[PDB]
Write a protein that binds this ligand. Structure first.
Ligand SMILES: [K+]
Lengths: 80, 120, 49, 46, 135, 178
RNA sequence: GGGGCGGUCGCCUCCUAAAAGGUAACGGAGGCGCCCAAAGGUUCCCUCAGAAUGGUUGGAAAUCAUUCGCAGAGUGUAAAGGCACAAGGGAGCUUGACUGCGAGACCUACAAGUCGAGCAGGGACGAAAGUCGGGCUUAGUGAUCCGGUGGUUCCGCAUGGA
RNA sequence: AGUCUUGGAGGUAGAGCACUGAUUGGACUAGGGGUUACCGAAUUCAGUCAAACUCCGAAUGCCAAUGACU
RNA sequence: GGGGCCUUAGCUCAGGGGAGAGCGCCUGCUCGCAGGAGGUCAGCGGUUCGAUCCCGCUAGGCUCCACCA
RNA sequence: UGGUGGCGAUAGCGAAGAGGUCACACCCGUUCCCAUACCGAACACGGAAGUUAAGCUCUUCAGCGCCGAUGGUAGUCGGGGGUUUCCCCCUGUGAGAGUAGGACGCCGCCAA
């Protein structure tokens, strides 16, 4: 005879991380990073979505960038 | 022993909060205000380049009054900064209140600037 | 407990808005000034009786 | 001072039973005191 | 018997034992010590058996530093159950030892003694050791 | 105010000579006086706060703030946010008026008054005084008082040491225990 | 890890998970089936835990006051990731907890799910810049059929109605 | 598509103790017990350890870019 | 072994807000009176602003199962 | 010197001195705009009696905090071996800790 486990649960995966590469071109409205909290900050021509999502205000070239001592931001710069 | 921070240190914390949102472009530069115990100052600043495009103050010679550091002085600076800025070709600005409450001297400078050409 | 409600444009009568309140906290008919797209302007919209 | 919450602060004449009168800030115009600093047995040292 | 006053988690992963010891690879506190030469779990039972051992040889004469602690717990399933249906109840406590770990240390006593003390300990443990001194 | 004039004309020069201050700005002054009444019995009676606020209004000549609980403490039957006392801050003119009255009128009327403690400084030039009964103040009508209540009076100075502060308060006329 | 019996069945968070993402087991830990009319919006202002020293009740612990004090607090709630130019605390005015949508992305067998600048309508707050399509973020839910209610320039079995 | 070159996201291996737990010895003691080291929490010095610890942090793998060679 | 339920004063039972009521037993009073007696709320460690009343485990007592070759 | 920006505390903290006429402050008023769950504290609005004590500015300092090689070592891609809970070797890469050292600000614009 045997007992019974009280665990065995877990959520579905939520596919976080970076959705576009540094130096990759993006169209306006492209998601650049999915995240819980602000692991990465919104930089130039990037907004922060309601679930902290980072996305391109413009069309242009992605850059992840050192933001201060600690933090990291992402920018989209205009192609020229 | 009471120990207490300077009112400027307190203001710089408040000014930071203002500057979070508000910032000067070449198109729409930042009309910063520093007031002081004795004087009031105004610089139209372009933050992308980091350049004061135009400027005016109670230390300028056109403003000639003994009661510098009052509301009546601020209106005179607000005129001078605006008209000098019109020569440079500045129309739209953003008013950086500079950590000070939008009131009295600081407001008087802003109102005078609105009256005399600048758009905010 | 907390219940479903309808707000209705007190002008045109258009049942414009569902929402939720707590009834114990809010026992009397709540009202808000939310846009009626029949009238095409903000009106008072009151909880339906 | 906010209007309507502070008592009207006046100059008050404090009259002691020993004959000493001194001006103190008070909400009452006159204050009669049986024992002041000049006549209290503690302060007189007697 | 040493065991932790509490833990965060009662059931742990068993883990692995690659590499030499992270620290505890010198004699620090006492003069002399028993260095491990092989990876093993040391039980809390083994420690006490190796402690009392070396202890009683010295005759109250000298000081021991046990330089391991059974912090990691392990489990087992009951006898004669099939696989599956959750992870087994916790069982005992094991300090992971790697090669290099100086497991005990001795002071107060001569080398002659200390050697013989630690010899007696070595036999209780389930690894090869060697004697060491402080440098 | 009498004490304010005394401070400027007599006390400040005397302190400057005694402690040999480089500049007038270093001379210890009284910055603020805070009066405090802990109404922990307000847990039983909400109206006890209103009484204490009223009494303290008469004493200080200024409406106090109702102090509210910072955290829940079951040992005192206390919940966070509950009104539990009153605090007022006297500065400028009213501070000197209150201090003059305290020293000259209120402190004498203490029953078996032996003077105020020389040891109730905080190591940083602030002086704290515990009053047992509010009835020492002449503004308090004895008949209206439902219950006798003490209060804490903190005199905050710009002194860096207890010696400087003790001197300042002695020269103001604070009746220290012999 | 035969079946029975026991346990479990959807959703969320963490670990396992091998530094993108994904990843199993009757593997290891917990949450959810809400709550809030402000605990939402905006404007302005602010800084927390704890300790030391001093204090009538009053004590380790209520309330002051002082100094020290990257957070040792807080963030409606599990956990994680975040957060002190605060996302934490306070106050004023409010209802954007808007209607029509939506370039373009993410996720994904499908069905669904997620983010979104921007445009129009008409607003809130603000001097203005601007911010606002609920809440620090991620659970709080259930296809179709069928039936109820409200609205409706639609249809209405010869025609007008129904 | 491979490879080189360049950029980037990420927290594993290892390591570390800055946080959270666990934990050894000494120093020094609040305080509580038999005026006392009688025993002592914190503090402090050194020392261990961690799938659900991290002040750190690879190799690889991954996503791209620009040419080149294939 | 597994599940399910239980553990409160002498006795019987009430009951997240700081542990009650009756009876017995004691107080003085002669079918009611008048105040006491007595609790590790089985225990443990924890959730928290407080825990008998959370939650997880340990006792013990009952109860139901433990089959098919 | 003031205002106001850019740059990872190499910018910081501490300590020790130095400077103020102008400029910045503290400071001195609360009649009025405006103000405080209480206060002219702060915020405002006014003024310049005097003060560099503090903020601020400028010097010195490496006590803490920061930055930080080099070599080595762990780890490891690929390829091999063995006595295989693990271990060794080969080309390549290469930490963390430690430390040599660095560092008590660097670059704008405007006004006077
Ligand atoms: K089987």
């Amino acid at each position: 005879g045997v007992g019974s486990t009280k665990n065995g649960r877990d959520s579905e995966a939520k596919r976080l991380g970076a959705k576009r590469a540094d130096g990759q071109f993006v169209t306006g409205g492209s998601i650049l990073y999915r995240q819980r909290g602000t692991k990465i900050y919104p930089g130039e021509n990037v907004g922060r979505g309601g679930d902290d999502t980072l996305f391109a205000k413009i069309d242009g070239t992605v850059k992840f960038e050192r933001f201060g001592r600690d933090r990291k931001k992402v920018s989209v710069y205009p192609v020229a | 022993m009471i120990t207490k921070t300077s009112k400027n240190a307190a203001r710089l914390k408040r000014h930071a909060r203002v500057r979070a949102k508000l910032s000067g472009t070449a198109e729409r530069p930042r009309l910063n205000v520093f007031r002081s115990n004795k004087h009031i100052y105004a610089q139209i600043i372009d933050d992308v380049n980091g350049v004061t495009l135009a400027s005016a103050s109670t230390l300028d010679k056109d403003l000639n009054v003994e009661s510098t550091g009052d509301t009546s002085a601020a209106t005179k600076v607000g005129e001078l900064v605006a008209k000098r800025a019109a020569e440079k070709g500045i129309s739209d600005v953003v008013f950086d209140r500079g950590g000070y409450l939008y009131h009295g001297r600081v407001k008087a400078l802003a109102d005078a600037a609105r009256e005399a050409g600048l758009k905010f | 407990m907390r219940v479903n409600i309808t707000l209705a444009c007190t002008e045109c009568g258009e049942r414009n808005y569902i929402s939720k309140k707590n009834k114990r906290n809010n026992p009397d008919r709540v009202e808000f000034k939310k846009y009626c797209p029949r009238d095409k302007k903000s009106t008072l919209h009151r909880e339906t009786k | 001072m906010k209007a309507g919450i502070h008592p009207n602060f006046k100059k008050a004449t404090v009259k002691c039973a020993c004959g000493n009168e001194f001006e103190t800030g008070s909400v009452k115009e006159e204050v009669r005191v049986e024992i002041c600093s000049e006549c209290h047995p503690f302060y007189t040292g007697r | 018997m040493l065991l932790p006053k509490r833990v965060k988690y009662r059931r742990e992963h068993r883990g692995k034992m690659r590499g030499r010891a992270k620290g505890g690879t010198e004699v620090h506190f006492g003069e002399f010590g028993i260095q491990a030469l092989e990876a093993s779990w040391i039980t809390n039972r083994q420690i006490e058996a190796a402690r009392i051992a070396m202890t009683r040889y010295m005759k109250r004469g000298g000081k021991v530093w046990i330089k391991i602690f059974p912090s990691k717990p392990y489990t087992a399933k009951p006898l004669e159950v099939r696989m599956g249906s959750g992870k087994g109840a916790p069982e005992g406590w094991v300090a992971v030892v790697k090669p290099g770990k100086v497991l005990f240390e001795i002071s107060g006593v001569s080398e002659e003694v200390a050697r013989e003390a630690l010899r007696l300990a070595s036999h209780k443990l389930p690894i090869k050791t060697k004697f060491v001194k402080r440098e | 105010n009498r004490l304010k004039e005394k401070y400027n004309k007599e006390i400040a020069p005397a302190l400057m000579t005694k402690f040999n201050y480089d500049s007038v700005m270093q001379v210890p002054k009284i910055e603020k006086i805070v009066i405090n009444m802990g109404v922990g019995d307000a847990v039983q009676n909400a109206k006890a706060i209103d009484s204490a606020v009223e009494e303290l209004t008469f004493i200080a000549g200024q409406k106090p703030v109702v102090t509210r609980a910072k955290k829940s403490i079951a040992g005192f039957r206390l919940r966070e946010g509950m009104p539990i006392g009153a605090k007022v801050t006297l500065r400028g003119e009213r501070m000197y008026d209150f201090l003059d009255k305290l020293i000259s009128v209120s402190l004498p009327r203490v029953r078996d008054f032996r003077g105020v403690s020389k040891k109730s400084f905080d190591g940083r030039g602030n002086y704290t005084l515990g009053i047992k009964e509010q009835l020492i103040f002449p503004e308090i009508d004895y008949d209206k008082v439902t219950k006798v209540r003490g209060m804490d009076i903190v005199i905050v100075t710009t002194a860096n040491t207890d010696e400087e502060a003790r001197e300042l308060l002695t020269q103001v006329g604070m009746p220290f225990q012999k």
